[PDB]
Amino acid sequence: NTDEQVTKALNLSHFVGSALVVKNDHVIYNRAFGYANKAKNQRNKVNSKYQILSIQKSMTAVGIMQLVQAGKVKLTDPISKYYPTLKHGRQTTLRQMLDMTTGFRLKSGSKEFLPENQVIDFAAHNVFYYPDKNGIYNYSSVNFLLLAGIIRKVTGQSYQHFFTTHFIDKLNLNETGFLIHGQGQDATTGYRALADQTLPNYDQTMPESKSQMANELGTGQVYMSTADLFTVESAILKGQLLSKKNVAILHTRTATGEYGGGVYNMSNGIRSHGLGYGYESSIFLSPDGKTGVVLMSNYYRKAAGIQATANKIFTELMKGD
Ligand SMILES: O=P(O)(O)OC[C@H](O)CO
């Protein structure tokens, strides 16, 4: 039985968070573990809200490809079309930004709590360009912040507004929003772990400021339940937000990396992973969007990482075990 096997693996790995497994469009596992907030004696629930972290980049990527489908941008466009003040790397294409094949990097945003337009301005003013990284896979979050700025510039909407109408409203997500406004009901607290810690003790929480949340524009500012994250990623692969032809164009790997169009592309599906602020998020999904695994945790432990567990579940699920 799948329930028995997955529960055993999650308990032996000391999982804290919510787990969802879907096979051929049917939920076969949906269970929560540990505490959303230990001091308040609030257990994690299947509908608890967790940080999606870098998995948000897959959504920013779809937003760019929606603009391509609508004739409003092209993947061959150079970044300098939208950021004319850049002094270097001006030829970098939107394609490369989506694939993490650029030389742009920004290790920190402003220490102030800024509105979106000023977060974009700060990044454009302060980003650095490494020519030796151009054209080769290297993970750099600023690419997706700058892509969120392109969404804003082309549409005349905030990224938050665009995300809300294109994902939250479109797919009737009821456990999704922006951390900066509060999670609301069924919220979770992120816990800080020691490097070698495997057992949860809830002895320290992980802080995150409004500045840090604003600076995650396009890149890791959203909370979701496991169900809402599955819904978004499956809807993308099913053609509900973007033609399947354009999903395939977007989700194309490069010569130097599986990453392309905001996800890692494999022979048997896609994967995305997030880590930050005490959280870890993991999705593996089949090419048709009908079979996959979502694990989200508010208690990240390097010595008990959840991606390896999700990878094992996914591999077995795709075989038939
Ligand atoms: O995005 P990955 O693949 O580097 O995994 C860790 C994330 O960057 C953090 O959110």
Experimental technique: X-ray
C-alpha distances in Å from residue 35, one per residue of 42, 189, 200 = 6, 9, 9
What is the dihedral sign for C-alpha 281, 293, 226, 2? negative
**CB of 95 closer than 8 Å to CB of 76:** yes
Tell me, in angstroms, the distance from the centre of ligand 1 to residue 198's CA: 21
Atom of ligand 1 nearest to the CA of 273: 5
Bridge partners, 30 (sequence order): 20
229 is in an annotated binding site: no
21-28: Cβ within 8 A, 24+ apart:
21/292, 21/293, 21/313, 21/317, 22/230, 22/234, 22/290, 22/291, 22/292, 22/293, 23/290, 23/291, 23/317, 24/290, 24/291, 25/290, 28/2, 28/3
Nearest of 20, 150, 43, 37 to residue 92 by alpha carbon: 150
Nearest of 75, 81, 65, 125 to residue 96 by alpha carbon: 75
48 is in an annotated binding site: no
C-alpha distances in Å from residue 188, one per residue of 59, 112, 128, 146, 204 = 22, 25, 35, 29, 14
Pairing status of strand 104-105 against strand 128-129: antiparallel
216 is in an annotated binding site: yes
CATH number of residue 166's parent domain: 3.40.710.10
Structure tokens at 256: 């130097």
Length of the chain: 321
Query: What residues make up the domain containing 172?
Result: 2-319
Three-state SS at 311: helix
| Contact 263 CB / ligand 1 (< 6 Å) | no
Nearest residue (by CA) to ligand 1, atom 2, is 273
Q: Angle at CA 145, nearest 5°, toward 267 and 59?
A: 40
Atom of ligand 1 nearest to the CA of 264: 3
C-alpha distances in Å from residue 319, one per residue of 18, 132, 261, 268 = 23, 41, 26, 10
Three-state SS at 223: strand
Distance CA 289, CA 287 (A): 6
Q: Looking at the 3D structure of the chain, how many domains does it have?
A: 1
Nearest of 102, 54, 24 to residue 264 by alpha carbon: 54
Structure tokens at 271: 């994967």
| Contact 274 CB / ligand 1 (< 6 Å) | yes
Tell me, in angstroms, the distance from the centre of ligand 1 to residue 138's CA: 11
| Contact 220 CB / ligand 1 (< 6 Å) | yes
C-alpha distances in Å from residue 200, one per residue of 22, 37, 39, 62 = 27, 12, 13, 36
What's the first-to-final CA gap in the chain, in angstroms? Answer: 9
